[PDB]
Amino acid sequence: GIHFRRHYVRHLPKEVSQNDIIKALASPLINDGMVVSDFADHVITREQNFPTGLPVEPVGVAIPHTDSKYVRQNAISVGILAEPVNFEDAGGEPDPVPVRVVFMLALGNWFDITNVLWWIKAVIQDEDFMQQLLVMNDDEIYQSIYTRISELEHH
Amino acid sequence: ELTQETGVSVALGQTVTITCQGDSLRSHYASWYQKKPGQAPILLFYGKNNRPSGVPDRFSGSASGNTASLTISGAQAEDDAEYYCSSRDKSGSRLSVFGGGTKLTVLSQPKAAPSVTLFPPSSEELQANKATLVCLISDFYPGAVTVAWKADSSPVKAGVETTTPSKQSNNKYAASSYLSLTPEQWKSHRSYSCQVTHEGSTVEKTVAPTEC
Amino acid sequence: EVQLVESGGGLVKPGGSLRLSCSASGFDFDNAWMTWVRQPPGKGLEWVGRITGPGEGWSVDYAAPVEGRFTISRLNSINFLYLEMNNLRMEDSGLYFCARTGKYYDFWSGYPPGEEYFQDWGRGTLVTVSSASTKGPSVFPLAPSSKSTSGGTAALGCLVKDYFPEPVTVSWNSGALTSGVHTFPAVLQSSGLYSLSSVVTVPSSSLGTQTYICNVNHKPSNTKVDKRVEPKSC
Incomplete structure (x- = not known):
């Protein structure tokens, strides 16, 4: 299963850097023991070589993550940005992606990694849900993601 | 499973494409291997467009429909070898499988x-x-x-x-x-x-x- | 950099058991997925099975023809991979390779669980399943004649018949004669025994005054045979 708790959702202020975002989303994961203590460092380094910006049409989405060996227990951490922050394109495109929704993925094995990536690719095709993420409070974001994750787990 | 031509012959220096076909390829990429007698297999190409460091640029992989292709642009005498495809045996499978292999005869x-x-x-x-x-x-x-x-x-x-x-x-x-x-x-x-x-x-x- | 070394291959009777090993160096073994692949005589590569890493709980997947008979395992402390093989069949014969296994998934075009690819391979260890018993060869002369003579040169040789296992060695005139020698790869017969031939091409003019002896040695049976090959003079 995937651990997803109320404190795995947060809104982030202006003037946050890409690294700050990674560190902020990794923080509750580290504090619950979901990831190794230097998890943020590993996500930063992997982002430098395998960028996670997704140019979907409401606003940009990023899916920062690192190797499964740095994850202790499956988890996801979500961040909503007050203003767009650039991530390099996850497909080798020249144009950077202005991102406002960040799904930090902490999956501890390959079969769960690929299954969640498939699921994410489906979720971001819902332009209206993505738009809802930009206005809902942390509670409503948590409930909506929790329900979708539980539906993923059923099957 | 995965099907490859049994044998393909190519004149020296010519471009040749060998193919690998199977239903799983509609969902999964193939990887390609060269095998010479008495030598370990060598990975040539995998995924959408990944060539390992050290593999000559004349080897390129591509994919269309339920087929995967390996193209050698300008075959050398040393390219005479067995070539194998590999991928999932069925879509979403945790198993892997090889194609039957193609013997590439480069007429040197x-x-x-x-x-x-x-x-x-x-x-x-x-x-x-x-x-x-x-x-x-x-x-x-x-x-x-x-x-x-x-x-x-x-x-x-x-x-x-x-x-x-x-x-x-x-x-x-x-x-x-x-x-x-x-x-x-x-x-x-x-x-x-x-x-x-x-x-x-x-x-x-x-x-x-x-x-x- | 990466070194993979298989061992443990050898001769075994059908129904028998064998354990293969593979030493790994030059990479982070504990987190690496590892695969066994085999190549039967004259056939292509066949996926045998793969063991995953700690995040997957070291789960193993097997090809259908070996499920239940073969067991893949690993020892992380010393970087070893193993393949235990029970109730061996003739069809299990061949060269067994261990391979470091990468994982690939393209986000935009991929489908779970992506693909596994084999980025480093060892040179393999040879497994031979046979019910044949050790047997020294019979050696017969292959005499030169007009029928094996072409433009100043004649072919003669020795037939090395019905031995097991490989290999045999052949020399000529105790190694004094090496030019023109061609020892052909052995044939594996339906009996389970091997046969080969060694030929030498020599000047036809001196068949009447030169002596040709083939020296056959079969180490597994401590067999040593010297066979003089006499000309037919016709």
Whole structure:
């Protein structure tokens, strides 16, 4: 299963850097023991070589993550940005992606990694849900993601 | 599973594409491997467009529909080898599978007909109540031959053993074929022949039980 | 850099058991997925099975023809991979390779669980399943004649018949004669025994005064045979 708790959702202020975002989303994961203590460092380094910006049409989405060996227990951490922050394109495109929704993925094995990536690719095709993420409070974001994750787990 | 051409021939320096097809390829990429006799396989290409460091740029992979393709742009003599595809055996499977392999013959020298020597059973072997005909085949290129044995003029299948071709130190090929028979069978016919077919042409050698 | 070394291959009777090993160096073995692949004589590569890493709980997947008979395992402390093989069949014969296994998934075009690819391979260990018993060869002369003579040169040789297992060695005139020698790869017969031939091409003019002896040695049976090959003079 995937651990997803109320404190795995947060809104982030202006003037946050890409690294700050990674560190902020990794923080509750580290504090619950979901990831190794230097998890943020590993996500930063992997982002430098395998960028996670997704140019979907409401606003940009990023899916920062690192190797499964740095994850202790499956988890996801979500961040909503007050203003767009650039991530390099996850497909080798020249144009950077202005991102406002960040799904930090902490999956501890390959079969769960690929299954969640498939699921994410489906979720971001819902332009209206993505738009809802930009206005809902942390509670409503948590409930909506929790329900979708539980539906993923059923099957 | 995954299907590849059994064999493909290409002229020196030419572009050639080999293919790998199967339903799983509609959902999964293939990886490609080169295999030479006595050597470990080498990964050439995998995924959408990944070439390992050290693999020459003339190797490229592509995918369309339920097919994966490996293209060699300007085949070198050294590219003569077995090529294997690999992917999932079925969509969403945790297992993997290889295609059957394609032998890529890169034609790097002129055609060379086989030299054939046929030996009758020795007096010693016959005295031991046994008999073996020995057909030795060498210096042919490309490395594929077909061997047929005849008793007088009728085909013989029983008692025939034939090797696969092997590359000689001069880069042509050799093979051998053996016909086992009884002394009585050997003596019962007027002749035995070893017929070696190479690129459609046959070299034939014949021995007679009663002749010196 | 990466070194993979298989061992443990050898001769075994059908129904028998064998354990293969593979030493790994030059990479982070504990987190690496490892795969066994085999190549039967004359056939293509066949996926045998793969063991995953700690995040997958070291789960193993097997090809259908070996499920239940073969067991893949690993020892992380010393970087070893193993393959235990029970109730061996003839069809299990061949060269067994261990391979470091990468994982690939393209986000935009991929489908779970992506694909596995084999980024480093060892040179393999040879497994031979046979019910044949050790047997020294019979050696027979292949005499030269007009029929094996072409333009100043004649072919003669020795037939090395019905031995097991490989290999045999052949020399000529105790190694004094090496030019023109061609020893052909052995044929594996339906009996389970091997046969090969060694030929030498020599000047036809001196068949009447030169002596040719083939020296056959089969170490597994402590067999040593010297066979003089006499000309037919016709």
